A = this chain, B = another copy of it.
């Protein structure tokens, strides 16, 4: 028996996503497919263009049997924390056998070699990393240079370690690294990256990136959106829009984020995860000097910062995601498995997950405190509660930006049950 895991966001689910999913299923020939998916906010620090319940339904119609929520504390982190949460969730199901992820190099052996070095921390590598951590290098840069120097000493190709600027391959390394850390037996595979680069922004016809498609949506070119998307993905996108639950764009939240930063002092940002390299002063000063979130982001931007990093820090700030909370989450991992949706076939593997899972399974959110109280699993209960409260908080915040005022009431985590799709 084999169960395919995939780590996904689907913002929106497009033709490239379908190609990847179909290829993964053809490669692994799984009996069941489980997706761990980012919620209402993705890894670039942007809102999903439609909410997690719609995108869970889309994934189910595209051939996922079970959709799990990647908790916000992981979903909005950079590659290291993102991968760690995703791999912990999939490993925790107790049924996942194989994981297939998109890749640029499409070389599983190189990705594995890098991860083993990061896991086993050779004495030579460690000495290099510290030297590179002086000379003021940021960790991901110092690590890259440390890895390059390790490769030379071992007579490998150091040039390869510059492959690791590509998003797909970075995540790939971190998936494997995470699996070694938690002692997972999951088998990992790559497929060569589908369609346009995740950062492209140009319309490629059939296969455009998700960022490009969201821009198409901004410009209201629906026919080009339609050409980018599977029929059911587009249909449900149109549904959410017609019913006033989309589209949701980051600039819709921009005035909130900017105003919120004007309520905060530097002491506040110092307590929030991810802040270093003068970014606290930058947030504080730029929030007072600029009048829109777009202008804010450009004021904070400098050569050594990505927009994505800045955008993530903005989400961490409004959700008050503090340093200690993230440190604990990146150690102990997710404390629950949240079910967003399943098919008829998915019911079967969920039944097995009840017996095999290493984390409490949450389906009915009204009952999550009872699940926590009743579980025999050695979870950190306080951390559990903090993590799931963040998930709920993000959904409630997100809902205020539904285009229709009528759609903004209530807590969707408690009012909407996991999607059940008949087969």
Contact = CB atoms under 8 A, between A and B. Distances in A.
A405 interface: yes
A400 interface: yes
Given A288-B411, A291-B405, A292-B408, A396 B320 contact: no
Most buried by B among A255, A262, A410: A262
State the copy count for this chain. Answer: 2
Interface string A298-342: 000000000000000000001110000000000000000000000
A107 to B, nearest CB: 44
B319 A263 contact: yes
A288 B408 contact: no
Contact of A262 (B291, B295, B396, B405): B396
Contacts of A410: 288-289
B258 A290 contact: no
Nearest to A410: B289
Contact of A289 (B290, B318, B405, B409): B409
Contacts of A262: 393, 396-397, 400
A304 to B, nearest CB: 24
A222 interface: no
Contacts of A292: 405, 408
B389 A263 contact: no
Nearest to A405: B291
A256 interface: yes
A361 B290 CA distance: 30
Contacts of A405: 291-292
A385 to B, nearest CB: 11
A75 B376 CA distance: 54
A260 interface: yes
Contacts of A295: 409
Contact of A259 (B256, B289, B411): B256
Interface in A211-265: 255-256, 258-260, 262-263, 265
A295 B405 CA distance: 11
Given A265-B389, A408-B292, A259 B319 contact: no
A396 B255 contact: no
Contacts of A318: 263
Given A265-B389, A389-B265, A259 B397 contact: yes
A318 B256 CA distance: 12
A72 to B, nearest CB: 13
Nearest to A292: B405
Most buried by B among A259, A263, A319: A259
A411 B284 CA distance: 12
Given A256-B256, A411-B288, A263 B397 contact: yes
B397 A291 contact: no
Interface string A365-408: 00000000000000000000000010001001100100001111
B256 A291 contact: no
Interface of A: 255-256, 258-260, 262-263, 265, 288-292, 295, 318-320, 389, 393, 396-397, 400, 405-411
Given A259-B400, A263-B320, 4 more contacts: A265-B389, A288-B411, A289-B410, A291-B400
27 contacts: A255-B256, A256-B256, A256-B259, A259-B397, A260-B260, A262-B393, A262-B396, A262-B397, A262-B400, A263-B318, A263-B319, A263-B320, A263-B393, A263-B397, A265-B389, A288-B396, A288-B410, A288-B411, A289-B410, A290-B409, A291-B400, A291-B406, A291-B407, A291-B408, A291-B409, A292-B405, A295-B409
